[PDB]
Structure formats: structure tokens, C-alpha cells
Amino acid sequence: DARSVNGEFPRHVKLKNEIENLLDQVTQLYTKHNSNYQQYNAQAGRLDLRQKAEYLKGLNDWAERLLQELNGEDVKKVLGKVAFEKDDLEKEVKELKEKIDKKE
Amino acid sequence: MDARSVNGEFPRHVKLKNEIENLLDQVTQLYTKHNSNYQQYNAQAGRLDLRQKAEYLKGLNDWAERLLQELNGEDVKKVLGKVAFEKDDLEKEVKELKEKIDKKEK
Amino acid sequence: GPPGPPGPPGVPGEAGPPGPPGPP
Amino acid sequence: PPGPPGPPGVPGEAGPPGPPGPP
Amino acid sequence: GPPGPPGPPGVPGEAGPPGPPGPP
């Protein structure tokens, strides 16, 4: 009760832990993204335009995939697909109720 | 589709660095505010009883978690759960109404 | 030349004002 | 080509009042 | 073609944390 402040001290530590770990993940992403650009600059010399674009695209694709996992944009994209499927099934019910109750 | 832009991939690199920097900035600010909040609590705690301590620290935790879940998309995962559940019941409703629409052709 | 993306979010606001005085 | 990103936003509003003080 | 203008300012920050319980 008193030592844990009714559970709110361990809750504080949980949140500090979660924030620390996310800060660590985002920092590492940031450093790897910048080091990826140096690798690109080093390679660019031997690559034609189509190959430069293909390599830089995969480096960007890598950063963005991780970033969208960290910032929850991956989950917002999922939410969108599911919300659309929900709002299409609602459009189906409205139609089928019209077709069944009237006209049949 | 240019040579100077690497077919759009160089400005895309800079965009992603910007997006990563801005998230790092938001999480850093959250981290510092969360730790400064605990000091404010420690300063006040002297004059508060256990129930009053818990009420104050709870609101400070509530604040941090609400922001964290907006940054890490856990707020949206909770919404996705409610919507997915609502979708699996609406699918059971359409199956019935499609059957009743089928049988009502008779 | 289309416009650039919006800038990053602002910093969170300061902590709220003290609550009202307690009872006598 | 697209312009650079805009400047940072304005700081948020102050938080809500705290609870009533003790007796 | 020249670069486009800078994008608009970012979104305001979230509200700060609750204030302290305030005076006895």
C-alpha cells in the first residue's frame, strides 16, 4: 500500500523502462540510417543510376519499415484496412435490409 | 524520376532522417518530463497522505502513458482491437441477412 | 515544386496550475 | 522538387488544475 | 524547376501534466 504508493511507483518505473527502451530503439535506428547513407556514398562510385536507386530504395525501405513499427504508423495502416472493411460491411447490411424488407 | 534525386530516393532518405529525428525528439522530451514529474511528486509528497500521494502520482503516470501510447501506437492497437471485434460480429450479421435475402427469393 | 511536409510537433505544455486550497 | 519540412509547432497548453489540497 | 516553398508549421504539442494538489 505505502511502499508501492498503491501500485503507482512500480507504474512510474514501468513507464520509465518503456520510454528508455523506445529511446534506445529510435537512437539506434537514427545512427544506422546515417551510416547507411555513408555505405551508399561509398558504393555509388561503382553503381549506374538504376543500381544507385535500387540500393538507396532498399536502405530507405529498411529504415521506414522499422520507423513505422516504432511510431505505430504500421498499426494505423492496419486500422485503416479494418475500418474500411467494417464501413463496407455496414454498407452491405443497409442494402440487404432495403432489398429484403421492402421489395420481397 | 531524376538523376540528381536518385529517382526520388535521396529526398526520401532525408525525409526518413527527419521523421526519425522528430520521433527521437518527442521520446526524449517525454523521458525528461516523466523524470521531472517524479521530482515534483517527491517535493509535494512531504505534505500529502498515502491516498493524496497516490492520486497525484497516478495523474502524472496517466499523463506519461497517454503520450507514450500516442507515440508508440499502443492507443491505436487498443482501438484496432475494439473495431476488429465489432467487425467479426457484423460479419455474423451479414451471413444471416444474406441467407434471409437468399431464402426470401421464394 | 510542391510544398514540403509539415514541421514536427511542438513540445508538450508546462504542468497545470495548483489545485484549489484544501478545506479548513 | 518538394520544399523542406516546416518549422516546429507551438508548445502545448498547460495541464489541468491539480486536485484540492489537504486539510 | 526550383524547390517548392517550406511546408507549414507542425501541430501544437499535447497539454502538460496535471498541476500539484496545491495548498493545504
Numbering used by the authors:
A (entry chain BBB): 4 to 107
B (entry chain CCC): 3 to 108
C (entry chain JJJ): 66 to 89
D (entry chain III): 37 to 59
E (entry chain HHH): 6 to 29
What do the authors of the reporting publication say about this deposited model?
To increase chances of crystallization, a shorter 24-residue peptide, JDM238, was synthesized which contains the GVOGEA motif flanked by three glycine-proline-4-hydroxyproline (GPO) repeats at each terminus. Crystals formed in conditions containing JDM238 and M3-NTD at a 3:2 molar ratio and diffracted synchrotron X-rays to 2.3 Å resolution. In agreement with our ITC data for CLC II-27 binding to M3-NTD, the M3-NTD dimer is bound to two copies of triple-helical JDM238. While both copies occupy equivalent binding sites on opposite faces of the M3-NTD T-bar, they contact the protein with two different regions ([Fig fig7]). One copy contacts M3-NTD through residues 15-21 of the C-terminal GPO repeats, the other is bound at its more central GPOGVO region (residues 6-12) ([Fig fig7] and [Fig fig8]). The presence of two different binding registers in the same crystal is likely an effect of crystal packing, as this binding mode results in a compact assembly required for crystallization ([Fig fig7]—figure supplement 1), but it also reflects a lack of specificity of collagen binding by M3, in line with the CLC screening data. The M3 collagen binding site includes the PARF region on H2 (residues 94-101), extending beyond it to include the C-terminal half of H1 and most of H2 ([Fig fig8]). Interfaces between the binding partners largely comprise hydrophobic interactions between highly complementary surfaces. M3 residues Tyr96 and Trp103 play prominent roles: they pack against Hyp and Pro sidechains, filling grooves on the collagen triple helices and form polar contacts with the peptide backbone. The indole amino group of Trp103 interacts with the carbonyl of Ala15 or Hyp6 (depending on the register), while Tyr96 forms a water-mediated hydrogen bond with the carbonyl of Hyp9 or Hyp18.
The M protein is an essential virulence factor of *Streptococcus pyogenes*, or group A streptococcus (GAS), one of the most common and dangerous human pathogens. Encoded by the chromosomal *emm* gene, the M protein is covalently anchored at its C-terminus to the cell wall, covering the GAS surface at high density and acting as an adhesin and a potent immune evasion factor. The M3 protein is produced by the prevalent *emm*3 GAS serotype, which is frequently associated with severe invasive diseases. To gain insights into mechanism and biological role of streptococcal collagen binding, we characterised the interaction of M3 with the Collagen Ligand Collections (CLCs, triple-helical collagen peptide libraries formerly known as Toolkits), and determined crystal structures of the M3 N-terminal domain (M3-NTD), encompassing the HVR, alone and in complex with a CLC-derived collagen peptide.
